[PDB]
Amino acid sequence: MGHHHHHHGSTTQRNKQIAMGRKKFNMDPKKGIQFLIENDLLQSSPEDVAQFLYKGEGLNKTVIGDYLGERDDFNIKVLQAFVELHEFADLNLVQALRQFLWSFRLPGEAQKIDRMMEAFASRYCLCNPGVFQSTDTCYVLSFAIIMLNTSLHNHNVRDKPTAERFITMNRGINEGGDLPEELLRNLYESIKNEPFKIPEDDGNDLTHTFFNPDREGWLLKLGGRVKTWKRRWFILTDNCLYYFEYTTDKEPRGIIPLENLSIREVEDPRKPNCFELYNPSHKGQVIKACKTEADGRVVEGNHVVYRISAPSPEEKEEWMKSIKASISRDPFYDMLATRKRRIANKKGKVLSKIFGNKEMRILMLGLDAAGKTTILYKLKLGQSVTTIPTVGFNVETVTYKNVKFNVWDVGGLDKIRPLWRHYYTGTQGLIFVVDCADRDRIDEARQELHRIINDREMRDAIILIFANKQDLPDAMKPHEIQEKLGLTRIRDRNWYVQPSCATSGDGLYEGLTWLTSNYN
Numbered sequence: 001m002g003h004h005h006h007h008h009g010s011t012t013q014r015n016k017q018i019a020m021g022r023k024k025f026n027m028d029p030k031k032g033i034q035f036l037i038e039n040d041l042l043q044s045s046p047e048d049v050a051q052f053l054y055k056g057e058g059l060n061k062t063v064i065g066d067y068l069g070e071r072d073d074f075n076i077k078v079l080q081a082f083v084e085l086h087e088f089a090d091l092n093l094v095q096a097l098r099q100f101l102w103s104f105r106l107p108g109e110a111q112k113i114d115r116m117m118e119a120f121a122s123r124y125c126l127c128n129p130g131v132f133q134s135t136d137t138c139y140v141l142s143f144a145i146i147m148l149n150t151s152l153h154n155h156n157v158r159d160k161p162t163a164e165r166f167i168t169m170n171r172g173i174n175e176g177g178d179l180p181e182e183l184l185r186n187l188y189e190s191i192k193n194e195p196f197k198i199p200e201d202d203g204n205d206l207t208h209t210f211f212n213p214d215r216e217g218w219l220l221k222l223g224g225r226v227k228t229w230k231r232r233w234f235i236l237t238d239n240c241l242y243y244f245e246y247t248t249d250k251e252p253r254g255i256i257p258l259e260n261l262s263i264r265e266v267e268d269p270r271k272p273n274c275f276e277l278y279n280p281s282h283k284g285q286v287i288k289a290c291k292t293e294a295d296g297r298v299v300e301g302n303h304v305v306y307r308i309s310a311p312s313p314e315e316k317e318e319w320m321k322s323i324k325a326s327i328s329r330d331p332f333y334d335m336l337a338t339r340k341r342r343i344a345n346k347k348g349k350v351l352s353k354i355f356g357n358k359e360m361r362i363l364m365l366g367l368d369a370a371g372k373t374t375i376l377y378k379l380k381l382g383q384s385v386t387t388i389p390t391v392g393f394n395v396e397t398v399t400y401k402n403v404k405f406n407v408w409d410v411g412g413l414d415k416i417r418p419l420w421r422h423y424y425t426g427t428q429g430l431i432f433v434v435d436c437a438d439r440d441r442i443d444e445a446r447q448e449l450h451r452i453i454n455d456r457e458m459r460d461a462i463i464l465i466f467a468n469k470q471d472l473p474d475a476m477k478p479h480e481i482q483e484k485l486g487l488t489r490i491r492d493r494n495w496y497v498q499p500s501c502a503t504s505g506d507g508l509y510e511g512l513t514w515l516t517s518n519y520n
Ligand SMILES: Nc1nc2c(ncn2[C@@H]2O[C@H](COP(=O)(O)OP(=O)(O)OP(=O)(O)O)[C@@H](O)[C@H]2O)c(=O)[nH]1
Pocket: 366, 367, 368, 369, 370, 371, 372, 373, 374, 375, 385, 386, 387, 388, 389, 390, 391, 410, 411, 412, 413, 433, 468, 469, 470, 471, 472, 500, 501, 502, 503, 504
């Protein structure tokens, strides 16, 4: 295999591939289908692909429609097999349309709609011979039914057709003659009683972190320790530089918080239009970043610089200008680096491998301003620092009473929260930090907490709540926090509410003691 050795077993790996295949499909249907075929989870025939789409388990129905509408020879065959899996016999045209329109969402392009509705009409007529004199009749009536659905049910259409209007509107449609009055009336009445129920695509953008970015585009980037070049889709937004393998990916490959970095033009012997991201104040020091490993676990980057090649000098200039404008500049970052380096223990590596100490991966989440970063550095540096809001994440490893805690502190601002799920994989303990003086946002904190702990990737995590800011007047006590966060209901999980004051340190060691005592 050649992987780091973590969760490895049949059910684990197979379910992961299944989930990976679906995620890929929803970003790019051709690529998801190819992944599943390569991973022996799907057979390559049009009929097999059709069955996969027809079941559509965890598949975006708009994406299904996009794929089925394509002009490709393979896609045309998939479409025909897809319509063949629908049984329209002994159903009227509205009932058949209800069924078909549950299975996918119609694409926007006229030629794609036409291909799909021709395939539907042909199938309907084969299933119900003699009802319509031609496929054309069936196709046109299908759109008369769709237009009726709009006219009756969209408030923007003022004049609602009567049954008699619908009947007469369709005169001559049956290859020059009229369809049965009672058939048209039945169709009208069905639509009038119940609009078409349409599946609604929610969740495609898994995140919504990258919406309306400062800049995006393809670049080539050089690796950290292993100096290999990779083509990556970059998105610059909210003081972070993200990169992805494919534009269809819904999770980043890498995240680079733009904290006190600079940009320089460089010459490269093989790649054109190159620049580097680097830290001018700490030459040779690792740039804070994270990247995703094969199993989805986020890990720290190893870069001292990021060398990047743009496809033209124009795009190079654009990217440099944009990145420079998006750098978060603040003494805070230099303060952290300097203090960390002072108490940086070289021996720690030779002792960590020898004690062979086991450790504990921690994800620390909570609303913005809760106290997360203050807690992190109180633990890491033994001192209370003056923080600024965290645009991406901070990550530190803290040794406490023979346990090494690898602590991921993720920014809690609104815009960042859809990205929290990115950091779940591998989490052994959740620290959820709450501002106990903030009664205005306690219900919001409750909502966020339960979304986290109900996630499939977080089911096994023990839960430490830091009921923070106990120093403040009228701050909610641990028993109130227990109630307000709805923890009392949860009797099947291991959780604890630890009162804390991050700025004095009160309660922090107690919380770490609880984690060690309860981690199994
Ligand atoms: N009074 C009081 N203030 C605190 C306490 N802990 C943290 N703070 C302050 O609350 C503010 C926000 O704390 P941070 O540690 O930056 O909060 P955060 O959770 O990291 O916020 P994000 O980076 O946006 O996710 C800072 O001014 C801290 O000094 C505390 O225990 N008592």
